[PDB]
Design an enzyme around this catalytic site. Structure first.
Site, PDB file in Angstrom:
ATOM      1  N   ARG A  66      60.166 118.922  40.236  1.00  0.00           N
ATOM      2  CA  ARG A  66      59.344 117.674  40.366  1.00  0.00           C
ATOM      3  C   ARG A  66      59.849 117.160  38.636  1.00  0.00           C
ATOM      4  O   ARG A  66      61.261 116.691  38.803  1.00  0.00           O
ATOM      5  CB  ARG A  66      57.603 118.487  40.093  1.00  0.00           C
ATOM      6  CG  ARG A  66      56.905 119.119  41.476  1.00  0.00           C
ATOM      7  CD  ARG A  66      56.630 117.732  42.048  1.00  0.00           C
ATOM      8  NE  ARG A  66      55.975 116.319  41.323  1.00  0.00           N
ATOM      9  CZ  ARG A  66      56.740 115.020  41.619  1.00  0.00           C
ATOM     10  NH1 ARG A  66      57.936 114.837  42.762  1.00  0.00           N
ATOM     11  NH2 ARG A  66      56.864 114.188  41.055  1.00  0.00           N
ATOM     12  N   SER A 123      57.669 119.794  32.024  1.00  0.00           N
ATOM     13  CA  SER A 123      56.757 119.833  32.161  1.00  0.00           C
ATOM     14  C   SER A 123      56.716 121.309  33.375  1.00  0.00           C
ATOM     15  O   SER A 123      56.098 120.110  34.964  1.00  0.00           O
ATOM     16  CB  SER A 123      55.588 118.712  32.064  1.00  0.00           C
ATOM     17  OG  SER A 123      55.262 118.069  32.690  1.00  0.00           O
ATOM     18  N   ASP A 175      52.371 105.591  36.373  1.00  0.00           N
ATOM     19  CA  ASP A 175      53.670 105.970  36.430  1.00  0.00           C
ATOM     20  C   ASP A 175      53.777 105.833  38.456  1.00  0.00           C
ATOM     21  O   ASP A 175      54.419 106.651  38.861  1.00  0.00           O
ATOM     22  CB  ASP A 175      53.594 107.099  36.234  1.00  0.00           C
ATOM     23  CG  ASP A 175      54.610 108.456  36.145  1.00  0.00           C
ATOM     24  OD1 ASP A 175      55.883 106.972  36.162  1.00  0.00           O
ATOM     25  OD2 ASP A 175      55.523 109.565  36.422  1.00  0.00           O
TER      26      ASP A 175
END
Ligand SMILES: [Cl-]
Ligand SMILES: [Cl-]
Lengths: 13, 331
Positions: B46, B50, B155
């Site tokens: 991903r 984070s 986003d």
């Protein structure tokens, strides 16, 4: 060392 | 001589008439679940930041997704949490299942219901013309919902659209940059991925709205029907606007800047140049022609506009002729 940010790693040690 | 104010054409006052608890994420008190419920199975490619993992709920053997939020700005965390909870159960929105934290490090993590981890970027090159329209329509379902719930995603990109093609199900994910829309509020323009940043972000116009997501959606569509990913491929934020100006033209850009009385960073003076507006047909070729139609080009033309107010809203987009067959089949 089977902990990652508190989470246990599934199936570790 | 400051910038001209702007308002969203749709859902302008959805948050004003809602209780404070809905949008006031800073006062939100987080309730923690049991971290021992979950065990990490495998890391997912991903954000690589984070970090996100595939995981298992060992209390019922259900697959889940865990997003560990390191580092820890507390305000940004509560925002994402509040938005996820507000939108939970909505059409094509990822479902937040639980919130836990490491008792030692105090590092918090979000737990999501399991989702097939193929993203629209992996899927699109194998899709027919109809499938692209189908999934684009599904994305609009999610955007119209979140916009109607007073939230801009900020986003939108192929990586944030999870698709289980087998079950034809779609989820819009990663609401970590999402924000509540309040009419007249000035927002940080350092959002979205470079390739999907709207002109309003690039020229530093802060009073933007849901229409930001519609530009990003336009960038996605363009890359898919033309088979050029990403479509506007800048090397930095400055060059990104240059890439756009080479397509949309500099005349409409300066019209846009004038209309909102925007003060352009003087560094754009020596890089922007002068460029004519390019017809969308110029990007059509033998390899992509089966994905292009008059409807697709007209639809694209009404999304990729400098003036955020002139772009189609999510709801207007769903009524475009581009989706006529999809809507007809849905009934
Ligand atoms: Cl922000
Ligand atoms: Cl909208």
């Amino acid at each position: 060392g089977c902990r990652l940010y508190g989470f246990k790693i599934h199936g570790c040690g | 001589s400051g910038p001209v104010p702007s308002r969203a054409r749709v859902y302008t006052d959805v948050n004003t008439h809602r209780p404070r608890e809905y949008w006031d994420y800073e006062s939100h008190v987080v309730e923690w679940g049991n971290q021992d419920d979950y065990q990490l199975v495998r890391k997912l490619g991903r954000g690589k930041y984070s970090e996100v993992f595939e995981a298992i709920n060992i209390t019922n053997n259900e697959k889940v997704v865990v997003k560990i939020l390191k580092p820890v700005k507390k305000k940004k965390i509560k925002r994402e949490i509040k938005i996820l909870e507000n939108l939970r159960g909505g059409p094509n929105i990822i479902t937040l299942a639980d919130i836990v934290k490491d008792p030692v490090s105090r590092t918090p993590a979000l737990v999501f219901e399991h989702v097939n981890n193929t993203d629209f970027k992996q899927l699109y090159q194998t899709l027919t013309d109809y499938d692209i329209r189908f999934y684009m329509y599904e994305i609009l379902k999610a955007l119209d919902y979140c916009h109607s719930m007073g939230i801009m995603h900020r986003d939108v990109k192929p990586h944030n659209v999870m698709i289980d093609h087998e079950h034809r199900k779609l989820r819009l994910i990663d609401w970590g940059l999402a924000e509540f829309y309040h009419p007249g509020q000035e927002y940080n323009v350092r959002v979205a991925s470079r390739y999907f940043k709207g002109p309003e972000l690039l020229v530093d116009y802060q009073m933007y709205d849901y229409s930001l997501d519609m530009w990003s959606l336009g960038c996605m569509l363009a890359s898919m029907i033309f088979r050029k990913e990403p479509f506007f491929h800048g090397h930095d934020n400055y060059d990104q606007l240059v890439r756009i100006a080479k397509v949309l033209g500099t005349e409409d850009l300066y019209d846009y800047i004038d209309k909102y009385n925007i003060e352009l960073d003087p560094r754009f003076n020596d890089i922007l140049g002068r460029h004519s507006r390019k017809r969308w047909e110029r990007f059509v070729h033998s390899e992509n022609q089966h994905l292009v139609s008059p409807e697709a080009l007209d639809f694209l033309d009404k999304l990729l506009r400098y003036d955020h107010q002139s772009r189609l809203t999510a709801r207007e987009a769903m009524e475009h002729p581009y989706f006529y067959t999809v809507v007809k089949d849905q009934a």
